[PDB]
């Protein structure tokens, strides 16, 4: 239903919040990496916005993001959680029980986000491109990309987003 938005908003605030706490991020802190074009391939009703919450410590960031994501997921009801494993496999190719999720995610993140491909990126303006997202006819889905300020930080944010968008495929029949 429309709680999917309730959730993405909870996440967006919890993320924006922990970065500020666990990493001294702020709306007015220099940004190494800036977001360029942020769009979706198959956009069936998702309005996108980018927010800056930059800080210098990429690892403090990555930890805050995983943290928020874990807190948020832990807030879902047993009934809701059950749909997550499917999203996972759909957006990443990874089996997972309703428990091993949190862990499996962390592993995926840690690996991916530390890849040379990622950490070695010295390209200042980076484009975020998800590929599918849906929104109800009445109300569209609002997605916000929180720019951590680092290639490694945004890598986590992006992975999170890829999952989120795969959950919007469930609201729209």
């Amino acid at each position, epitope marked *: 239903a429309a709680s999917i938005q309730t959730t993405v908003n909870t996440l967006s605030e919890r993320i924006s919040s922990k970065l500020e706490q666990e990493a001294n991020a702020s709306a007015q802190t220099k940004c*190494d990496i800036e977001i360029g074009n942020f769009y979706i391939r198959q956009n069936h009703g998702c309005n996108l916005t980018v927010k800056n919450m930059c800080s*210098a410590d990429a690892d403090a960031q990555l930890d805050a993001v995983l943290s928020a994501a874990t807190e948020t997921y832990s807030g879902l009801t047993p009934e809701q959680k059950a749909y997550v494993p499917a999203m996972f496999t759909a957006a990443l190719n990874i089996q997972t029980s309703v428990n091993t999720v949190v862990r499996d995610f962390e592993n995926y993140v840690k690996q991916t986000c530390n890849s040379s491909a990622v950490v070695d990126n010295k390209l200042k303006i980076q484009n975020v491109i998800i590929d599918e997202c849906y929104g109800a006819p009445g109300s569209p889905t609002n997605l916000e990309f929180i720019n951590t300020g*680092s290639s490694k930080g945004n890598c986590a944010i992006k992975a999170l987003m890829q999952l989120t968008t795969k959950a919007t495929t469930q609201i729209a029949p």
Partner: antibody, heavy 119, light 113 residues
Framework: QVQLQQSGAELAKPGASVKMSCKASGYTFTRYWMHWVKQRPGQGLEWIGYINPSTGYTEYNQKFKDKATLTADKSSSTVYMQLSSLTSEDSAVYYC????????????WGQGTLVTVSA | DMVMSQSPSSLAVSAGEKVSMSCKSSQTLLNSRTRKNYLAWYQQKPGQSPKLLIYWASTRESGVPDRFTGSGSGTDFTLTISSVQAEDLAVYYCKQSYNLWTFGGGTKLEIKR
């Protein structure tokens, strides 16, 4: 207290290279950006480039792009700046500075490292 | 690209008197949205390292006496020392942090005696 210890003075032959250091302590190394600045005897300050200790991300002044190279060792909490193909024009004192929280201004400075390029 | 012009190059003043120097950029350092001016002032006393005095166009850095005042906006800024003292002898540099970083040529402050 916050403190930045830069290496000692240096004398190099023209065409040679040199590599200075800045040892940081008294704050989380990975929480602030580190900038470098040049100053020829009797002249003003000049921005060279900066580096993010945590990610190794760097950006230089177009003017120094091929002369200076910034690196950082998180395990030792020290930042290195290396100058190549030296010339009399490179003779000056170099400073490392830790930024403020927002990363825009230089809150703390090293004592500087004087480099002399002469045969 | 970006060019910082300070003026005058140097000025003499006696202790007690007041002074003002100018810093002008070839580009605006103001962020319309936030109202922030990405410009700071640095003091460098003979034989020493540069010290941060004012950041954000007018905010005093911790421990800096209030006789130092940062003003201006957009592309015209002024540093003002209410009542200079011998110890204030130094060269003052203004630096922009909007589009990368740039220092002015500085204004050498001399003391009349």
């Amino acid at each position: 207290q916050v403190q930045l210890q830069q290496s000692g003075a240096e004398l190099a032959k023209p065409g040679a290279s040199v590599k200075m250091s800045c040892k940081a302590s008294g704050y989380t190394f990975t929480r602030y950006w580190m900038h470098w600045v040049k100053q020829r005897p009797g002249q003003g300050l000049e921005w060279i480039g900066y580096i993010n200790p945590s990610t190794g991300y760097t950006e230089y002044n177009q003017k120094f792009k091929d002369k200076a190279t910034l690196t950082a060792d998180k395990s030792s909490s020290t930042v290195y700046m290396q100058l190549s193909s030296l010339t009399s024009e490179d003779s000056a004192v170099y400073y490392c500075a830790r930024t403020t929280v927002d990363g825009y201004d230089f809150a703390y400075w090293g004592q500087g490292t004087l480099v002399t390029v002469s045969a | 690209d970006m060019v910082m012009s300070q003026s005058p190059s140097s000025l003499a003043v006696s202790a007690g008197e007041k002074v003002s120097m100018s810093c002008k950029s070839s580009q605006t350092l103001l962020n319309s949205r936030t109202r922030k001016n990405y410009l700071a002032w640095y003091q460098q006393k003979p034989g020493q390292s540069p010290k941060l005095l004012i950041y954000w166009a007018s905010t005093r850095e911790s421990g800096v006496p209030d006789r130092f005042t940062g003003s201006g906006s957009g592309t015209d800024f002024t540093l003002t020392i209410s009542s200079v003292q011998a110890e204030d002898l130094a060269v003052y540099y203004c630096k922009q942090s909007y589009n990368l970083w740039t220092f002015g040529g500085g204004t050498k402050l001399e003391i009349k005696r």
